[PDB]
Ligand binder design. Structure first.
Ligand SMILES: Cc1cc2nc3c(=O)[nH]c(=O)nc-3n(C[C@H](O)[C@H](O)[C@H](O)COP(=O)(O)OP(=O)(O)OC[C@H]3O[C@@H](n4cnc5c(N)ncnc54)[C@H](O)[C@@H]3O)c2cc1C
Ligand SMILES: NC(=O)c1ccc[n+]([C@@H]2O[C@H](COP(=O)([O-])OP(=O)(O)OC[C@H]3O[C@@H](n4cnc5c(N)ncnc54)[C@H](O)[C@@H]3O)[C@@H](O)[C@H]2O)c1
Ligand SMILES: O=c1[nH]c(=O)c2[nH]c(=O)[nH]c2[nH]1
Ligand code: FES
Ligand code: FES
Length: 1295
């Protein structure tokens, strides 16, 4: 047959013409209109596309449920399954407990990840209605969230756990009733009786065969060796989508019973090749639990690899054979299967052979010794024998859901009753183009005794055998080499212990108890979290929600997937799709463009270039950017043109048929390239105070050095998206955009078209994250699309894929700092000179303002009487860098804390003492001459140091450190000051419009956009207090250029301060109009006043506006206030590093934050944790790599590792400072968005201390660049392993 039949949320689907290249995500969203399930990445990393599958399993004879990534599930694999999406478990009329709890617990901010997390938690509960805390965290390994910091999500779902004033009340949560879950489609139960027959699906390019029997599979492969096997599609899905490979014949064997069997034999367990590795997990788990330790050494090796193997979504469908035959050089399983010589059985039509995975199974890049007509039937995973021990290792950039840098299986077999080596196997991933054995090192150790000589021998061997070319793909050559020695050392120590417990301690020797911690398998304690905030007064009306923890107004709809993001908006019947075509060279003239292949693609409409621009090709904030490339491209990812087509699939294919010819031009990539070439955005910026010559002469000590700070991708989970709708009259156009900047979107589209602004309407409902990345760079999509719509007279839409978004839109500015600080022996700093260099990319954008903010913050919290800061903004052939939460502040303040760390240690005084005595006091002037009034930072400091019990913890850390050789702890307390207001004064303005309808209901709008920070929630809270009506009677629908004009972007943490005042004033005007009707009827209700004013013909509409008074700094005169006030905060953080791998635990973080009198402590704490965890990523995890030719390598969650559920401080405590009203801002609040982010430097400097301790154990003022990744941490822990590894064309360059 050829009809595809499955169910979605209980509703039957018959697809008569199923295309093999159609993903379930595309089918749900575009074909069925169910847009709760989101696209976040397309590569199986983010889990925003998570849905549940149910089916009758023919083999275990029961209904089963598991989770999948819809983005990677082919609909042609889903015959006779039942899909459940977020829409199928509940809605706002009747939320499922999962939805209720994530929403009420403040677990949904921007809302974009909330459906996929719901669906992960939902699936766990359908499998296990009483899970453990462990099982709950484990459920979300495949789910990323960029806003919340994860804490509230876990805290809310802890209420489900078997073994489980305040922000929420878990006792109002309605109970789970599993009888109320949706029926498994009866029809699917009826069909379980019928045998499965072979299916054939035919699309544009691809034919899919679903083989029902092994005979059919082997026949097909005999007659057509070229048929591509697809099982989980977790590899092929990626090959097709990201490496533009096309397999025109696919066969899916997933149904075949022989490929799904589990047979327990004498030598081990044999898994069918199509067994999902989730089934491998459950089988080996049960086996490990019931069998003796002695014979489950290999099994435990596999389970250890599978712990750190993606998450539940991938492992549900990913097959064991899948991973083997893919032959990735970084398989986590193949090293283990090889090290254990696992038995693989192969078959074709009328042949069958068995072999042991050794080095010959993997001959070359991505090849196996399988013949083209042959398929893998099964892998036996062996029982271990007496005197046989195994370890598995993996080090990445992040523990969870990451791809190996180095990964290994290691096996030793001892001659019986001995410590003499019979067999040894050391196999590695990530060290060559294939899984390799250390064949030249292993044989030398035969019959040797397991001792310090074998340990040194093997290490010398691995050092010589596992060479890396400096060009070697992936880089990190020293770290990768070190890792192989380090893993073997752990194996060595582990074997000693295992010998020990076999009663041969007398022969091999005891383990020094300070080495024991080396061999321990990763374990985390259960989390503990604390949230402290201030109750509102006794007096305050229960209808006055200002200061109360009101949940985000859209939380319920976000958990239900009813909240509408831009691409969720239904398509017009005549709507077209746009796809950007981008430069693949950093600097080069465009010689020619050939659209000849692009036109052959069915659906192609046109290719837009500079020539099609009606009016101006000059755009960007400083008018120095092209809408489309004209003559030369100036970065890899420079936008050249845009394809327009009927569908996105057709737009993408057509876009591949635009062939461009280039002629290269001198490229300027790095900060150094830029310095050498004097290529800069404008002149040097400078702040200078006191006498620098004097200060340095007086200083007992002077320290000099450099610090590099890597950039950051925003990874808003909703990428950039615009729909442009042309109106056909007078140049009128309406845009629906995920942007923080409606005004610039409007202006840029207007100018590009050559029509006045009054013709262009930009509408923003909400964004799934912004973080500064949608302050300006959203417009490169908006303009291309506006043009397509103008040209065609048709609606046009573009949502960027994650790879596109990451390449085109740029990030946080990398900084290079050169510093010279002079101080006394007491720790007091008397002179500071710091040169700052940013890499700004190929347009000015916000770069100059960012450098200004960095300089405004080079003091951090410290009075420095003699100080000189300069910044220079490099102009390079890279994507233009832009605003990222902090806007140069974090960069500024890290440099300050870096040299401050070096002062502390040069003086041999405690860090905290040196910091405290250097701290400004109330009434002081900054280096830019602004008075610090209401300086709460000391209170923040004294509270945090006391509540975190900093001094006692110091002692515990010191103790751990001298009792452990290969693990070390560090502890650091970091303050911050953050200035509040746009560096550009006139941007400190906002507007509101309010209407009161005759039913008494209020429709409010202001210039701010909602991106998950809870701005609308806050403004509703404000309006409610202002008008003295319940929040229930006030609504905000959207943000729009034709309701409030000339709005500043939603940025600089300012948007609640500005819009809050606007809203307030709009409400004051209304109240003034209602006054006389209130006097006549003081008790009669709101509705009566309103209807009275209407029937007396009094206006019930009003604008409101606010400007921040008394702002304006001058760099000429070093006078005037840049800031309206300052945010202040302090964080104490503890880490434990692994000295042999570079991995670390974030053990505990304590934050005290001054948000004034919080408008909303639930949102404010959320913003603290969110900001903090972004900082955490910036300073420890998140790293962007570029080729020396300036091509971003790092384009997806696979290779760009943001903080995961497992990344957050195990113990995470946030307190909002009590009794600190900030009268100048709306209802005595303070901004909160950005200031907390820098406090994650506490973890950077805590890692610093741990490294220092590791160095003393095995050069002072050692270098630690940001981000402090595994690579840097491990490389800085110099030891006998690094020293034997350490000593051109290369994969990447430091930009
Ligand atoms: C988000 C994400 C995270 C990942 N993390 C990891 C990780 O941590 N470690 C890791 O090692 N891998 C990882 N992978 C890779 C992938 O998940 C595994 O390699 C997986 O086992 C592939 O199995 P599959 O069934 O999806 O293979 P498919 O993609 O269906 O097929 C893969 C290849 O195997 C072939 N094939 C499948 N079965 C057979 C058979 N019986 N005989 C012959 N050929 C066959 C196919 O033709 C194809 O060439 C990750 C992938 C994703 C998307
Ligand atoms: O699958 P995928 O997309 O995740 O990975 P990939 O095959 O796209 O990437 C190659 C990776 O495997 C390793 N590798 C491949 N060839 C190598 C060589 N010649 N020398 C050293 N290391 C090498 C590197 O660690 C590298 O990061
Ligand atoms: O002073 C600022 N100006 C901005 O334009 C901006 N954008 C941002 O994210 N933070 C800041 N800060
Ligand atoms: S969209 Fe499917 S995993 Fe990210
Ligand atoms: S709230 Fe999770 S990505 Fe925004």
């Amino acid at each position: 047959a050829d009809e595809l039949v499955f169910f979605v949320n209980g509703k039957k689907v018959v697809e008569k013409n199923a295309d093999p290249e159609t993903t379930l995500l595309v089918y749900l969203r575009r074909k069925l209109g169910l847009c709760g399930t989101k696209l976040g990445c397309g590569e199986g990393g983010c889990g925003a596309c998570t849905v549940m599958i149910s089916k009758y399993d023919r083999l275990q004879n029961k209904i089963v449920h598991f989770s999948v990534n819809a983005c990677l599930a082919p609909i042609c694999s889903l015959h006779h399954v039942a899909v459940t999406t977020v829409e199928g478990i509940g809605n706002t009329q009747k939320l499922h407990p999962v939805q209720e709890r994530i929403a009420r617990s403040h677990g949904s901010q921007c809302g974009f990840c909330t459906p996929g997390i719901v669906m992960s938690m939902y699936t766990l509960l359908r499998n296990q209605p009483e899970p453990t805390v462990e099982e709950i965290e484990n459920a979300f390994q495949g789910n990323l969230c960029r806003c919340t910091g994860y804490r509230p999500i876990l805290q809310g779902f802890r209420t489900f756990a078997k073994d489980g004033p305040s922000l929420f009340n878990p006792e109002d949560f309605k109970p789970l009733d599993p009888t109320q879950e949706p029926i498994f489609p009866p029809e699917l139960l009826r069909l379980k009786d019928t045998p499965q027959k072979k299916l054939r699906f035919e699309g544009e390019r691809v034919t899919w065969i679903q083989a029902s029997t092994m005979e059919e599979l082997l026949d097909l492969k005999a007659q057509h060796p070229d048929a591509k096997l697809v099982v989980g599609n977790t590899e092929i899905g990626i090959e097709m989508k990201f490496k533009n490979m096309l397999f025109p014949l696919i066969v899916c064997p997933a149904w075949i019973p022989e490929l799904n069997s589990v047979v327990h034999g004498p030598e081990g367990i044999s898994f069918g090749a199509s067994c999902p590795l989730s089934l491998v997990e459950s089988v080996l788990a049960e086996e490990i639990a019931k069998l003796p330790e002695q014979k489950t050494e290999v099994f435990r090796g596999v389970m250890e690899q599978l712990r750190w193997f993606a998450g539940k979504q991938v492992k549900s469908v990913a097959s064991i054979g899948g991973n083997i035959i893919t032959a990735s050089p970084i398989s986590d399983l193949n090293p283990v299967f090889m090290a254990s010589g696992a038995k693989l059985t192969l078959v074709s039509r009328g042949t069958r052979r068995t072999v042991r995975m050794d080095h010959t199974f993997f001959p070359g890049y991505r090849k196996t010794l399988l013949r083209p007509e042959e398929i893998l039937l099964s892998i036996e995973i062996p029982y271990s024998k007496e005197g046989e021990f195994f370890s598995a290792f993996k080090q990445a950039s992040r523990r969870e859901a990451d791809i190996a840098k180095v990964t290994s299986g290691m096996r030793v077999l001892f001659k019986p009753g001995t410590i003499e080596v019979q067999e040894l196997s050391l196999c590695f991933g990530g060290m060559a183009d294939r899984t390799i054995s250390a064949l030249k090192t292993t044989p030398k150790q035969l019959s040797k005794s397991w001792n310090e000589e074998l340990l040194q021998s093997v290490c010398a061997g691995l050092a010589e055998e596992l060479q890396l070319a400096p060009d070697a793909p992936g880089g990190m050559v020293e770290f990768r080499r070190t890792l192989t020695l380090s893993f073997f050392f752990k194996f060595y120590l582990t074997v000693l212990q295992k010998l020990g417990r076999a009663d041969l301690e007398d022969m091999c020797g005891k383990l020094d108890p300070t080495f024991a911690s080396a061999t321990l398998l990763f374990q985390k304690d259960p989390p503990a979290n604390v949230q402290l905030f201030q109750e509102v007064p006794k007096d305050q009306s229960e209808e006055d929600m200002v200061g109360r923890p009101l949940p985000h107004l859209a939380a319920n709809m976000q958990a239900s997937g009813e909240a509408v993001y831009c691409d969720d908006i239904p398509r017009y019947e005549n709507e077209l799709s746009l796809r950007l075509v981008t430069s693949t060279r950093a600097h080069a003239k465009i010689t020619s463009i050939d659209t000849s292949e692009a036109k052959k693609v069915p659906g192609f409409v046109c290719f837009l270039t500079a020539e099609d621009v009606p009016n101006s090709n000059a755009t960007g904030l400083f008018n120095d950017e092209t809408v489309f490339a004209k003559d030369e491209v100036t970065c890899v990812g420079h936008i050249i043109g845009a394809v327009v087509a009927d569908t996105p699939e057709h737009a993408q294919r057509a876009a591949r048929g635009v062939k461009i010819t280039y002629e290269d031009l001198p490229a300027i990539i790095t900060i150094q390239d830029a310095i050498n070439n004097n290529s800069f955005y404008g002149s040097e910026i400078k702040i200078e105070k006191g006498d620098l010559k004097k200060g340095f002469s007086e200083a007992d000590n002077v320290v000099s050095g450099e610090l590099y700070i890597g950039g950051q991708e925003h990874f808003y989970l909703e990428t950039n998206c615009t729909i442009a709708v042309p109106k056909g009259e007078a140049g009128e156009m309406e845009l629906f955009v995920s942007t923080q900047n409606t005004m610039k979107t409007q202006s840029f589209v207007a100018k590009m078209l050559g029509v006045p602004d009054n013709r262009i309407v930009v509408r923003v409902k909400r964004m799934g994250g912004g973080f500064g990345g949608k302050e300006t760079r959203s417009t490169v999509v908006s303009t291309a699309l506006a043009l397509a719509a103008h040209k065609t007279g048709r609606p046009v839409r573009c949502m960027l894929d994650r790879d596109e978004d990451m390449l085109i839109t740029g990030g946080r500015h990398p900084f290079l700092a050169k510093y010279k600080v002079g101080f006394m022996k007491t720790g007091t700093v008397v002179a500071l000179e710091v040169a700052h260099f940013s890499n700004g990319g190929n347009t000015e954008d916000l770069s100059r303002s960012i450098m200004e903010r960095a300089l405004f913050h080079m003091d951090n919290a410290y009075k420095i009487p003699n100080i000189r800061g300069t910044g220079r903004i490099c102009k390079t052939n890279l994507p233009s860098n832009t605003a990222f939460r902090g806007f140069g502040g974090p960069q500024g303040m890290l440099i300050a804390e870096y040299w401050m760390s070096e002062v502390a240690i040069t003086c041999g005084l405690p860090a905290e003492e040196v910091r405290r005595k250097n701290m400004y006091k109330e009434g002081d002037l900054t280096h830019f001459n602004q008075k610090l009034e209401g300086f709460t930072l000391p209170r923040c400091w004294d509270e945090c140091i006391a509540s975190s019990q900093y001094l006692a913890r110091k002692r515990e850390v010191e103790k751990f450190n001298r009792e452990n050789c290969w693990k070390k702890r560090g502890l650091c307390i970091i303050p911050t000051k953050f200035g509040i207001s746009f560096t550009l004064p006139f941007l400190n303005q906002g507007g509101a419009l309010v209407h009161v309808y005759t039913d008494g209901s209020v429709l409010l709008t202001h210039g701010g956009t909602e991106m998950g920070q809870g701005l609308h929630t806050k403004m509703v809270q404000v309006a409610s207090r202002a008008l003295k009506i319940p929040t229930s009677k006030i609504h905000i629908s959207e943000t729009s250029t034709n309701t409030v004009p000339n709005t500043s972007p939603t940025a600089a943490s300012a948007s609640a301060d500005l819009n809050g005042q606007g809203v307030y004033e709009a409400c004051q005007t209304i109240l003034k109009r209602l006054e006389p009707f209130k006097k006549k009827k003081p008790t009669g209700p709101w509705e009566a006043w309103v209807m009275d004013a209407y029937t007396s013909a009094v206006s019930l509409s009003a604008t409101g506006f606010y400007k921040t008074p008394n702002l304006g700094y001058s760099f000429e005169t070093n006078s005037g206030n840049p800031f309206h006030y300052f945010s202040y905060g302090v964080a104490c953080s503890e880490v434990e590093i692994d000295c042999l791998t570079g991995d670390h635990k974030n053990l505990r973080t304590d934050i005290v934050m001054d948000v004034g009198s919080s408008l909303n402590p639930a949102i404010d704490i959320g913003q603290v944790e969110g900001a903090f965890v972004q900082g955490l990523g910036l300073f420890t995890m998140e790293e962007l790599h570029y080729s020396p030719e300036g091509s971003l390598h790092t384009r997806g969650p696979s290779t760009y590792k943001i903080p995961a559920f497992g990344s957050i401080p195990i113990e995470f405590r946030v307190s909002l400072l009590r009794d600190c009203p900030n009268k100048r801002a709306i209802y005595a609040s303070k901004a909160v968005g950005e200031p907390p982010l820098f406090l994650a430097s506490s973890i950077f400097f805590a890692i610093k201390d741990a490294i220092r301790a590791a160095r003393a154990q095995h050069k002072q003022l050692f270098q630690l660049d940001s981000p402090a990744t595994p690579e840097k941490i491990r490389n800085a822990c110099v030891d006998q392993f690094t020293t034997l590894c350490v000593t051109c064309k290369s994969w990447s360059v430091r930009i």
